[PDB]
Amino acid sequence: TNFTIAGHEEFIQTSSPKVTIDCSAFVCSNYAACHDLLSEYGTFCDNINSILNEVNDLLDITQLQVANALMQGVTLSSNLNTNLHSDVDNIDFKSLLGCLGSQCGSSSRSPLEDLLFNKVKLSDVGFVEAYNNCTGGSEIRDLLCVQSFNGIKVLPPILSETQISGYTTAATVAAMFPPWSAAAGVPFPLNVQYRINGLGVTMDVLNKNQKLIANAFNKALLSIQNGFTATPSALAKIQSVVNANAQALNSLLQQLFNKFGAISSSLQEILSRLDPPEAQVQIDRLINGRLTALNAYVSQQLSDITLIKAGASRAIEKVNECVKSQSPRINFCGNGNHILSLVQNAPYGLLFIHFSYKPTSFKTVLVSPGLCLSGDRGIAPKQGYFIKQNDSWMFTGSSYYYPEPISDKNVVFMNSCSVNFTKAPFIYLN
Amino acid sequence: TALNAYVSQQLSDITLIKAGASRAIEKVNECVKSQSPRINFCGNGNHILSLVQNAPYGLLFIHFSYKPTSFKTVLVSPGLCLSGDRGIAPKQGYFIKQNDSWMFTGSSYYYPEPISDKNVVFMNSCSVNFTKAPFIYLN
Amino acid sequence: TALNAYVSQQLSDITLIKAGASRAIEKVNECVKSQSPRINFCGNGNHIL
Amino acid sequence: TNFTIAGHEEFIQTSSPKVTIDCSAFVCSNYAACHDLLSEYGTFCDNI
Amino acid sequence: NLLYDSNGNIIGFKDFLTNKTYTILPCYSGRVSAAFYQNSSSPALLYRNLKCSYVLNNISFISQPFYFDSYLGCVLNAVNLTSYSVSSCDLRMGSGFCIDYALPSSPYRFVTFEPFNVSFVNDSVETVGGLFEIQIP
Numbered sequence A: 001t002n003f004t005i006a007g008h009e010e011f012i013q014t015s016s017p018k019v020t021i022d023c024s025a026f027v028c029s030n031y032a033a034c035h036d037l038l039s040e041y042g043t044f045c046d047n048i049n050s051i052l053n054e055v056n057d058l059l060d061i062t063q064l065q066v067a068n069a070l071m072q073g074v075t076l077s078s079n080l081n082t083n084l085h086s087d088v089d090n091i092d093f094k095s096l097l098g099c100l101g102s103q104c105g106s107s108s109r110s111p112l113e114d115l116l117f118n119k120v121k122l123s124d125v126g127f128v129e130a131y132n133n134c135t136g137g138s139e140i141r142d143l144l145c146v147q148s149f150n151g152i153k154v155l156p157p158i159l160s161e162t163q164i165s166g167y168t169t170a171a172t173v174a175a176m177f178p179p180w181s182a183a184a185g186v187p188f189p190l191n192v193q194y195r196i197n198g199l200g201v202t203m204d205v206l207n208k209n210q211k212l213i214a215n216a217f218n219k220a221l222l223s224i225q226n227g228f229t230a231t232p233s234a235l236a237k238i239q240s241v242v243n244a245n246a247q248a249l250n251s252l253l254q255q256l257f258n259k260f261g262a263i264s265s266s267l268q269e270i271l272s273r274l275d276p277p278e279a280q281v282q283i284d285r286l287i288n289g290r291l292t293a294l295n296a297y298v299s300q301q302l303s304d305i306t307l308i309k310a311g312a313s314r315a316i317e318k319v320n321e322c323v324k325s326q327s328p329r330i331n332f333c334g335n336g337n338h339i340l341s342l343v344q345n346a347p348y349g350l351l352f353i354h355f356s357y358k359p360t361s362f363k364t365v366l367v368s369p370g371l372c373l374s375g376d377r378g379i380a381p382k383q384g385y386f387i388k389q390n391d392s393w394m395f396t397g398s399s400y401y402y403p404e405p406i407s408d409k410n411v412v413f414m415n416s417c418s419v420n421f422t423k424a425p426f427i428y429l430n
Numbered sequence B: 001t002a003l004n005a006y007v008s009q010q011l012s013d014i015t016l017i018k019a020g021a022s023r024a025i026e027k028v029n030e031c032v033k034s035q036s037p038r039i040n041f042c043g044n045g046n047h048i049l050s051l052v053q054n055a056p057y058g059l060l061f062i063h064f065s066y067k068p069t070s071f072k073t074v075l076v077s078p079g080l081c082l083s084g085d086r087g088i089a090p091k092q093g094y095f096i097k098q099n100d101s102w103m104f105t106g107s108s109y110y111y112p113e114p115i116s117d118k119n120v121v122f123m124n125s126c127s128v129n130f131t132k133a134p135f136i137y138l139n
Numbered sequence C: 001t002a003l004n005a006y007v008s009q010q011l012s013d014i015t016l017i018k019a020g021a022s023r024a025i026e027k028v029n030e031c032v033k034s035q036s037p038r039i040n041f042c043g044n045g046n047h048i049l
Numbered sequence D: 001t002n003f004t005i006a007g008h009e010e011f012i013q014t015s016s017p018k019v020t021i022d023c024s025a026f027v028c029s030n031y032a033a034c035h036d037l038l039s040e041y042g043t044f045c046d047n048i
Numbered sequence E: 001n002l003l004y005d006s007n008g009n010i011i012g013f014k015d016f017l018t019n020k021t022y023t024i025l026p027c028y029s030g031r032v033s034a035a036f037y038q039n040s041s042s043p044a045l046l047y048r049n050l051k052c053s054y055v056l057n058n059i060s061f062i063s064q065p066f067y068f069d070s071y072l073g074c075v076l077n078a079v080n081l082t083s084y085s086v087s088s089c090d091l092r093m094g095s096g097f098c099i100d101y102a103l104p105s106s107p108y109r110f111v112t113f114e115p116f117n118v119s120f121v122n123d124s125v126e127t128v129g130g131l132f133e134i135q136i137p
């Protein structure tokens, strides 16, 4: 009988930090005698750097595919000026828009995206600022100093955060002003009513409660923005990516302190207490041990990008089948009743905002799946039921109770009187 | 040790091929042998047909699209409300005003045609964001 | 060395199981609990339910 | 002109048996001298 | 007399002859990323996370007349032309930056990478007379 509009979040990982490791400086950083024994494994170290290159190339291709899907066939006006109006149909979309155009600075993220990057330190800009504060200054206690000097460094991606944040903004303003390149016409106030009607709600109620729908979207976005001052499932998955990458780099760094059966772990101590003839047996145990740890990291990193690339394919589909064009698929974008979906930038992935149709009240009525008329004819409802009000047959929707007269625009005709249809030789339509 | 490293790369390489081959099977069953209502799936927006050909170590797809050539600006309306608090909205098109009369045009080609029952939808409410036109009753 | 070969093999087969399970979830939501307009997805073209 | 209804079946794998391996049960069963040579490798078994 | 961390590395000591305390820090050992064209004569160098006035004074002694600070580090043999944007590059250096070597100062350049854009239309977003203005093919 009554209905409201709900909303929920969703995070899909589409990126991963790019790590570049060189086996030359990892095992034979500066010692000359180390290179004489590593030359026999020359092909072994060449393959390690070769696999790490093709892994980072896959993250570069997937990053361009996401940016291409966000602005695939989008048309905006040259006089848009998304800094004065910022509203449509009395709906506040200011928290989802940053700055569009070259008339701004280096930061153009929306207010909602600022709540996600202020809680993640090791972001795209975090690694750049961290590595800068090692070759100069004081209080060098960060762990990234040692990893960078030993041959473990993280490279920035091709597209920056500002560029990707500017692509999600263009996709949001697309379905707000003409020519509405994100909905093929059907403006935003009308696009919502068309999809709610598809669930089984008559349009006589939607045109009378336009203020209730407008205030529902404003309340839903306000609860999502205020929900970040807590521990939700969205922030838990984002922080799990930057924490799993730190543990993998610190575990590989501790491999330089192991002995693997040798007398010590430092190559300077071995080359200072043993003669050259009996020193190759101790260095060979360190080379054969450190190279094994590299293969364990390369094989694990390759098995991890496959799950990220597979998950990135689902994010591209939701941009094309849930954001830029609503698909007739059911139980794909959200959970049953689905209306719209919006995309925002997130650290190492994207954030989705799904809106749903949630009823509040209910009532019990008697319905019929179809009645046979006089003349061996029959009728069947179309997304609805047949009710009996005041000794007369009416029509109501499957998602909203509103009796309407039976017509030919919402009833499927049939030329056969079934045995399990209620008889009613009083209703005339033709 | 070199053989263990080579066989480990084969398990990771074929895993990516299985993901790519799964999309090719779905594309054959939904783009060439059948037309599915999925926008931005078989092509870049306006997709019409699709053909498949044999290629070394994979398949080759041929996608046909719909590319406009010229454009023309025109004032359109998202819908109008008739007399008696009744409403009417277009489907896959817009409403245009030509020679002091309301007509219908497509959303992908400019061709004015008279309004009919098979080109619009019928409602029972008169929203405040539409335009009034009592001169048209069944035109 | 034998344990590394077993662990590295599990990281490769877990992706095939997780990828196949994602197709099962998509089939329940589009072929069992709902009738999707997709053709040649739930059956051989003449699929009913 | 005439028709009938046919039935088919298919199987899609979803889960896999869970396997767990111990640190001091596969390399060194119960011998203390064996554990001394394993401690110098660091956290090699902990990463497994 | 020695200071260690949790990982087991020495990060300080104390001298027993002068009663002074110090702090040991790891010395720089990095790697240079250079981009080279097809038939050029010298590639463009880029020291990541290394500000200028430190490479040409402490680790490098080669006379380099062209050098400037960038968002990624000190770039050698290049010109600052970040205002120019190009949607196609084969030398990608970082977060939205390209070189875009020009056919023959320094021949190499340093521009911004903008691969995707939007199609603008000269229309009005505000309604006039209750109607909307769009383009129909």
Ligand SMILES: *[C@@H]1O[C@H](CO)[C@@H](O)[C@H](O)[C@H]1NC(C)=O
Binding pocket: A001, A002, A003
């Ligand atoms: C639905 O709920 C709203 C909010 O409480 C209320 O204003 C409205 O009267 C309700 N409508 C019906 C039909 O109960």
Ligand SMILES: *[C@@H]1O[C@H](CO)[C@@H](O)[C@H](O)[C@H]1NC(C)=O
Binding pocket: A088, A089, A090, A189, B128, B129
């Ligand atoms: C609909 O009309 C009201 C009344 O002035 C106005 O405030 C609102 O902006 C209009 N909506 C659109 C989408 O034009």
Ligand SMILES: *[C@@H]1O[C@H](CO)[C@@H](O)[C@H](O)[C@H]1NC(C)=O
Binding pocket: D001, D002, D003
């Ligand atoms: C169709 O086949 C069934 C089974 O033999 C038979 O009972 C039925 O009469 C047939 N119908 C027609 C129209 O041939």
Ligand SMILES: *[C@@H]1O[C@H](CO)[C@@H](O)[C@H](O)[C@H]1NC(C)=O
Binding pocket: E016, E017, E018, E019
């Ligand atoms: C350092 O301090 C200790 C204790 O105060 C003192 O005994 C010693 O003589 C000092 N060393 C020098 C070189 O003065």
Ligand SMILES: *[C@@H]1O[C@H](CO)[C@@H](O)[C@H](O)[C@H]1NC(C)=O
Binding pocket: E068, E069, E070, E080, E081, E082, E083
């Ligand atoms: C490079 O040029 C841009 C714009 O021309 C300017 O903002 C920037 O400060 C310049 N950088 C240097 C190091 O001169």
